[PDB]
């Protein structure tokens, strides 16, 4: 039935918690009906959207308002919440109902008088009724029943109040807060709201994230409130924690220009990184003499090395395995080698052990990723054994990314002479732990370590991120070869040298950048952050204020 | 001095928040960020006291 529009002003407030407070002003962030909002009136079953929550009110009796339905598109496929107001009680049920909402026959049967359901078994709550009548016209003439319906996470909450009002076909002023009449732990998805009039009028509004300053009197009753998003004066009250503001100028907030658009720019690289030559090399060096391969001037798709079968580990250090695809790198290396398999932990940046100390060490910072896969085949052949392991070093803690294959004599201190027995001659050991197709540590885990050096120097390896155009003269969210930031881009007209990629100011912050495709130099000017203060003549004089940026 | 302190990198992998958020995941970035907040807050408190 036909709509109309009005406003609330003094409604939408409810007790946000189950806590008793008195004689205080309490600031809370929750879903509330904004004080000045457009409330839609309907004549008195239209289906309305359900967003964060719904404000409902109507000066009508239970003989018309027989209940409400909340849920997703109503069907037998998903559960819906049916709230019905009976003569002496309220019955609430959740189920895959097609209908079930009749409760009164007349003529309107085309979408009614049907009772289809499934395995309800979901919070069939019953209580005293939501709607209580008055002694005819011995009250204030009609009773505006108010409800708030919330759906947060596992709970559907109902707040309400009665408080009879002076007769008017509109919403009242004054002030009243609603109480949590019902609190139901229902894991239900609600996207649509429908009334049950079985056909006056009713009002519907929507809740929004707002911070309110609530005033509790001596009896712990909310008697008033301030909506912080209503205006500069309300904002001032909320920052000062007072419903009265003295004459003067106050600092309340911070102005900020939003970027709106975004810019993504990378070097025009069409080459792909030769990861196949690393991970599918089939020829893996021993850790004793690990193979260092450099990757450059290519696009690095790392997701294919992560979202892939057969890998036993993919441990990233200093970087996320799901974000590295959006990063630019310089001088990327891939260290390829074979270890016993139970030694995987020894190639972590900070662990100890013969591998960590003598064969292959990573630096404390090590930005990079350690990737390994079982591959028992090819390497662990029966009768085979091809994996040198360095055991005796003389010194200790070789060095990060260092390699030692001199194969000398481990003087044990037994005597300063050249020999084998008692001299521990031969730094590696021939008895490689191959134990073909048996035991533990039978040489599974081919290892590739990706070392990601992150310099401000020109990117040579970039992920598979599509570039876009420039905007200029507007505050934007930009990314120039990984140089992420926000600001206004303009031509710099600066004398950059041929080898310089970007510049910095006296504070050593990025001042300008070179565009990777056009090679032009753009200045980066931070967008306005201003600062907002409010000039108040005194609330005992006027509620008019001026705003200074 | 107050400005220079922004580049201190107080035990974090980077002095720049954007280079942490774009690099590490949620629970990881929080650790690096807490280090920068602690240091920057201490630097600012020192400034105000002076």
């Amino acid at each position: 039935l036909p709509p109309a529009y009005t406003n609330s002003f003094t409604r939408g407030v409810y007790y946000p918690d189950k806590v008793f407070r008195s004689s205080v002003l309490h600031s809370t962030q929750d879903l509330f009906l904004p004080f000045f909002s457009n409330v839609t009136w309907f004549h008195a079953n239209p289906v309305l959207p359900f967003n964060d929550g719904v404000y409902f009110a109507s000066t009508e009796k239970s003989n018309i308002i027989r209940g409400w339905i909340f849920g997703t598109t109503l069907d037998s496929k998903t559960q819906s919440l049916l709230i019905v107001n009976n003569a002496t009680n309220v019955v609430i049920k959740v189920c895959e109902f097609q209908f079930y909402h009749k409760n009164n026959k007349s003529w309107m049967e085309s979408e009614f008088r049907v009772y289809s359901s499934a395995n309800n078994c979901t919070f069939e709550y019953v209580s005293q009724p939501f709607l209580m009548d008055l002694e005819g016209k011995q009250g204030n003439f009609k009773n505006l029943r108010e409800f708030v319906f919330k759906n947060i996470d596992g709970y559907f909450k109902i707040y309400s109040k009665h408080t009879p009002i002076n007769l008017v076909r509109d919403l009242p002023q004054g002030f009243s807060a609603l109480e949590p009449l019902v609190d139901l732990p229902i894991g239900i998805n609600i996207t649509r709201f429908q009334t049950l009039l079985a056909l006056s009028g009713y009002y519907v509004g929507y809740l929004q994230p707002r911070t309110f300053l609530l005033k509790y009197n001596e009896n712990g009753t909310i008697t008033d409130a301030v909506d912080c998003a209503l205006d500069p004066l309300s904002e001032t009250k909320c920052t000062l924690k007072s419903f009265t503001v003295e004459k003067g100028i106050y600092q309340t907030s911070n102005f900020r220009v939003q970027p709106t658009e975004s810019i993504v720019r990378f070097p025009n690289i069409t080459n792909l990184c030769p990861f196949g030559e690393v991970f599918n090399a089939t020829r893996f060096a021993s850790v004793y003499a690990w193979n260092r391969k450099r990757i450059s001037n290519c696009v690095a798709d790392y997701s294919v090395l992560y979202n892939s079968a057969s890998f036993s580990t993919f441990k990233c250090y200093g970087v996320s395995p799901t974000k590295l695809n959006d990063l630019c790198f310089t001088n990327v290396y891939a260290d390829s080698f074979v270890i016993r398999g139970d030694e995987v932990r020894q190639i972590a940046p900070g662990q100890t052990g013969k591998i960590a100390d003598y064969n292959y060490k990573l630096p404390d910072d090590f930005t990079g990723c350690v990737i390994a896969w079982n591959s028992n085949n090819l390497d662990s052949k029966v009768g085979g054994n091809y994996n040198y392991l360095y055991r005796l070093f003389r010194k200790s803690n070789l060095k990060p990314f260092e390699r030692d294959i001199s194969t000398e004599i481990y003087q044990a201190g037994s005597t300063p002479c050249n020999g084998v027995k008692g001299f521990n001659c031969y730094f590696p050991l021939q008895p490689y732990g191959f134990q073909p197709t048996n035991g533990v540590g039978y040489q599974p885990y081919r290892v590739v370590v990706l070392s990601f050096e992150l310099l401000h120097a020109p990117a040579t390896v970039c992920g598979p991120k599509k570039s876009t155009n420039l905007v200029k003269n507007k505050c934007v969210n930009f990314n120039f070869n990984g140089l992420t930031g926000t600001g206004v881009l303009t031509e710099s007209n600066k004398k950059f040298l041929p080898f310089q990629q970007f510049g910095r100011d006296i504070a050593d912050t990025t001042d300008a950048v070179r565009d990777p495709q056009t090679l032009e130099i753009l200045d980066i000017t931070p967008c306005s952050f201003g600062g907002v203060s409010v000039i108040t003549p005194g609330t005992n004089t006027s509620n008019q204020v001026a705003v200074l940026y | 001095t107050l400005v220079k302190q922004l580049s201190s990198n107080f035990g974090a992998i980077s002095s720049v928040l954007n280079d942490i958020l774009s690099r590490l995941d949620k629970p990881e970035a929080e650790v690096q960020i807490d280090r920068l907040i602690t240091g920057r807050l201490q630097s600012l408190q020192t400034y105000v006291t002076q």
Binding site: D505, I506, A507, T509, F529, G531 | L2, V3
Partner: peptide, 24 residues
């Protein structure tokens, strides 16, 4: 333009990165 004395003019002439920082 500035209603300053000769001495005041000498005094004024002689004496000589918005990261959330501002000056009022």
């Amino acid at each position: 333009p500035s209603k300053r004395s000769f001495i005041e003019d000498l005094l004024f002439n002689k004496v000589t990165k918005f990261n959330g920082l501002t000056v009022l």
